[PDB]
């Protein structure tokens, strides 16, 4: 008779960017050729040694049937070996690792495990909009931590109203940062961990861009003293290895957090395809020069693109410290980012991400991703040049 | 410095299967060799054309990057074509199909999409124990529909208390049935759909064993006229195609249910690796010879096993109408099925599944999965024979 979705469905936050993606289709069907610098989809293929590890693994009939609920020990061991090689961090593979079907699933599981209806989650502004999903589906309340350029886009924890710290049960942090490009160090992480320890806040660090800091090796949150006491770090295969489509991620950290994850997941999953696990293990154990090479590709695109914007458009952009995103100020003749991104879409047929989809503190920037080939980057600039916008002002 | 799991975690129900598996692992740790007829874990390999489809697909760099949130259209189309071919049911691939990372995840998502705290979920007794997880996690309330042997293990909807039909938002049904092997027909599905329609209950049919009905051609719930009006059917690749480890499943049915699922999964569980999707497409469009051969193998195993048990133990068991499970009664000397299954594990080094985890109507039964070749099943019986039990 009448189909009735649950309240969790009715209250789901609107995916605001998806409306742009739809306008794109309606334009590309009218004849528009769109250059899309709005999304974080790696353009380059998964390295062939990873692909071949999947292809070989899939022939093993041991992976055809049900596997361990919590994943294969060989992958958890690869994860521990990886964290030691890359970050100098000691991880117990048997107690401190959990697997996820991508970071997005990990964020949902982690919030369901750590947030009660009515609890407060501390979330950065600007910040990855998907943080909102898990929090809303947990029926919890959001409290913003503003990231200002003056503070290097790191939150000031003493600015947080002490009135919320009792209800505050979870905090998100993300460095190297989407969308700002900013980076954090061991000292910041130590401070964060000290703060969470004092006010009993579970700390989830989103390390999706942990391979991509240009001036130095990125620090893991888990390098900080007391990080393992208060939190966990979410690591994705998506960006590091051009494995976005493969849907793999893991959490490393506090064994009590990991236990709660494992309990939840025992009710919903039976691990994941061992062919995928073996590919993940070949990714982690593989030559890190592949990832360094990938980092140099992004850095070249960043250098090429920002130099070209400045010369051709008079659009000066700060070079990011990490990630493949450029966080660019909009012309002061536009009031908001949605208005500027809409103007560029309509008049130049290009896509940038309006900064306000990351929160109110993004309203005067756009996010521009460097996951496109050189000539697409060039054609973006060529098209915008015709608009004659006052980027110089 | 105090980690505090959420109330969802604190109040999780017993993970009955996990607890059985754990006992089996502990026994194995002693160095004992075990014949494991517990979990319904297919012993035969994935058909090689499916494996080769994965291997070829993984070379395609389109699948290396993000794809469509709700799955590739080629797979949704293969699913519609499969449903037309096998069941004669018309499915709109653009609106009436959702993809899941396995039937177990599908159950979770469907309960989350359809139940509010305080709603009532109608569940069979006996029933798949994992129906309880999603219900409990949604903070919904459980109300049992007894499945009795004399009713053919079909529920009598007219015996449900009318008082609960107001708060009842969801009903699970499962034919061919885990654990009893019971089967259902078009008339029953029509009857259930009319009942759901009348009292506004969303109906989820679990069709995990839809390839394994031995006598009649298996009927989909969606063959019934009012079915797509009230509900949806959950189909797994695990049993049909020996794809248990691959974690792939789908729901087909009412477009509004499928919409709620999509909106949920958009935020959480986006489309799996496109390689897996192509493999799944090859599964569905593959010649149904392999499936029929698989069905024949399970049948021969059931025939063999039940006869041997009768001859050597005096353990009489009904042959199932479907699935690869046998549902068998425990001796009068045993208090509970847990005690009996523990006893066989400790003293015969064999695994069966204690019937109690399926509900109180399984209290005096065990489920045995025909998931090893005949000469393994013979050794299962030989081992139990040495215990001299009063199976009569
Ligand atoms: C901030 C951030 N977190 C996490 C992810 C990882 O996404 P996933 O592993 O679901 O592909 C990405 C993308 C991202 O931009
Ligand atoms: C009735 C029923 N439903 C759902 C499932 C879940 O199967 P999967 O997740 O492997 O698809 C199973 C297999 N245990 C089952 O027997
Ligand atoms: C089948 C396989 C299974 C069991 C439990 C699970 O959690 C997952 C899969 C069964 O009922 O044995």
Q: What is the dihedral of CA B372, B377, B379, B385, to 10 degrees?
A: 150
Q: Which two tokens stand for residue B54?
A: 């994965």
Across the beta sheet with B168-174, what order do the strands follow? B97-100, B249-253, B231-236, B202-206, B168-174, B120-125, B141-146
For residue A223, give the nearest of A255, A187, A247 by alpha carbon: A187
Is B163 exposed, middle or buried, given 0-12, 13-18 or 19+ CB atoms closer than 10 A?
exposed
Ligand 3 pocket residues where CB is under 6 Å? A 66, 270; B 17, 39-40, 104, 130, 178
Euclidean distance between CA atoms B86 and B88, whole angstroms: 6
For helices B374-385 and B337-348, angle between their N-to-C axes, nearest 10 degrees: 100
Euclidean distance between CA atoms A147 and A145, whole angstroms: 7
Euclidean distance between CA atoms A316 and A144, whole angstroms: 29
Phi then psi for A174, rounded to 5 degrees? -145, 100
Take atom 12 of ligand 1 and give the residue whose Cα is closest.
Answer: A208
Cβ–Cβ under 8 Å, residues A205 and A233: yes
Q: Which residues contact A240 (CB under 8 A, 6 or more apart)?
A: A210, A211, A283, A291
Euclidean distance between CA atoms A116 and A260, whole angstroms: 13
Cβ–Cβ under 8 Å, residues B342 and B23: yes
Euclidean distance between CA atoms A112 and A138, whole angstroms: 6
Euclidean distance between CA atoms B224 and B219, whole angstroms: 9
- Reported for A221-224, long-range contacts at CB under 8 A and 24+ positions apart, including other chains, are A221/A173, A221/A189, A221/A192, A221/A193, A222/A83, A222/A87, A222/A89, A222/A91, A222/A252, A222/A253, A223/A87, A223/A88, A223/A89, A223/A186, A223/A189, A224/A186, A224/A189, A224/A190, A224/A192, A224/A193
Euclidean distance between CA atoms A231 and A235, whole angstroms: 13
Q: Give, as one character, the DSSP assignment of residue A331.
A: P
Which of B105, B256, B273, B277 best tests the A interface by mutation, with the highest count of A CBs <10 A? B273
Which residue's entry shows tokens 């590709």?
A297
Q: Which two tokens stand for residue A6?
A: 């649950």
Q: Which residues of A284-321 are buried (b: 16+ CB within 10 A; e: fewer)?
A: bebeeebbeebbeebbebbeebbebbeeebebebeebb
Handedness of CA B207, B143, B268, A4 (dihedral sign): positive
Find residue B365's DSSP bridge partners: B329
What are the residue boundaries of the structural domains of chain A, listed by start? 1-64+287-387, 65-286
Euclidean distance between CA atoms B80 and B207, whole angstroms: 16
Euclidean distance between CA atoms B310 and A159, whole angstroms: 76
Structural resolution in Å = 1.9
Which of A267, A279, A369 best tests the B interface by mutation, with the highest count of B CBs <10 A? A267
Q: How far is CA B26 from the centre of its chain?
A: 25
DSSP string, B101-121: SSHHHHHHHHHHHH--TT-EE
- Distance from the alpha carbon of residue A4 to the mean position of ligand 1, in angstroms: 31
Pairing verdict, β A325-329 and A365-369: antiparallel
Euclidean distance between CA atoms A202 and A193, whole angstroms: 9
Ligand nearest to the CA of B367: 3
Take atom 10 of ligand 3 and give the residue whose Cα is closest.
Answer: B40
Please name the residue of chain A whose CA is at the shortest distance from the CA of residue B258: A5
Cβ–Cβ under 8 Å, residues B169 and B121: yes
CATH number of B65-286: 3.40.640.10
Q: How far is CA B384 from the centre of its chain?
A: 27
Q: Which two tokens stand for residue B257?
A: 């249910």
Q: What is the dihedral of CA A276, A281, A287, A289, to 10 degrees?
A: 60
Handedness of CA A235, A241, A244, A248 (dihedral sign): negative
How many residues in chain A?
393
Ligand nearest to the CA of B178: 2
**Alpha-carbon separation of residue A278 from A74, A111, A269, B195 (angstroms):** 8, 28, 18, 48
For helices B337-348 and B16-29, angle between their N-to-C axes, nearest 10 degrees: 20
Euclidean distance between CA atoms B125 and A64, whole angstroms: 31
Across the beta sheet with A120-125, what order do the strands follow? A97-100, A249-253, A231-236, A202-206, A168-174, A120-125, A141-146
Euclidean distance between CA atoms A154 and B65, whole angstroms: 30
């Amino acid at each position: 008779m009448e189909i009735t979705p649950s309240d969790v469905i009715k209250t789901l936050p609107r995916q605001e960017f998806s409306l742009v993606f739809q306008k794109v289709k309606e334009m590309e069907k009218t004849g528009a050729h769109i250059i899309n610098l709005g999304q974080g989809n790696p353009d380059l293929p998964t390295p062939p040694h990873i692909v071949e590890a999947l292809r070989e693994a899939s022939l093993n009939p041991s992976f055809h049937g049900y596997g361990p609920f919590r994943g294969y020990p060989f992958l958890k061991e690869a994860i521990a070996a990886f964290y030691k090689r890359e970050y100098g961090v000691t991880i117990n593979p048997e107690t401190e690792v959990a697997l996820f079907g991508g970071g997005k699933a990990g964020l949902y599981v982690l919030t369901q495990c750590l947030l009660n209806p009515g609890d407060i989650a501390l979330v950065p502004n600007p910040g990855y909009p998907e943080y909102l999903s898990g929090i809303t589906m947990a029926r919890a309340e959001l409290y913003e931590m503003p990231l200002y350029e003056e503070n290097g886009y790191l939150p000031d924890f003493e600015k947080i109203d002490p009135a919320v710290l009792e209800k505050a049960k979870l905090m998100f942090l993300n460095y190297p940062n989407n969308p700002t490009g900013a980076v954090a160090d061991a000292a910041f992480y130590a401070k964060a961990a000290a703060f969470a320890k004092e006010h009993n806040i579970h700390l989830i660090h989103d390390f999706a861009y942990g391979a991509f800091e240009f001036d130095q090796k990125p620090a893991s949150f888990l390098e900080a003293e007391d990080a393992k006491t208060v939190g966990a770090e979410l690591y994705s295969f998506s960006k590091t290895f051009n494995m976005a489509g493969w849907r793999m991620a893991f959490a490393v950290g506090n064994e009590k957090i990991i236990q709660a994850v494992n309990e939840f997941q025992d009710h919903v999953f039976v691990g994941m395809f061992g062919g995928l696990q073996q590919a993940a293990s070949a990714a982690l154990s593989g030559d890190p020069e592949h990832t360094e090479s990938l980092k140099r590709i992004y850095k070249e695109r960043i250098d090429f693109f920002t130099a070209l914007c400045e010369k051709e458009l008079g659009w000066k952009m700060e070079k990011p410290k990490g990630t493949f995103y450029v966080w660019a100020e909009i012309p002061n003749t536009f009031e908001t980012s949605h208005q500027f991104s809409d103007y560029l879409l309509e008049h130049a047929h290009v896509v940038v991400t309006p900064g306000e989809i990351f929160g109110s503190n993004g309203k005067r920037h756009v996010r521009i991703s460097m996951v496109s080939k050189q000539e697409d980057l060039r054609e973006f600039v060529t098209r915008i040049q015709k608009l004659n916008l006052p980027f110089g002002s």
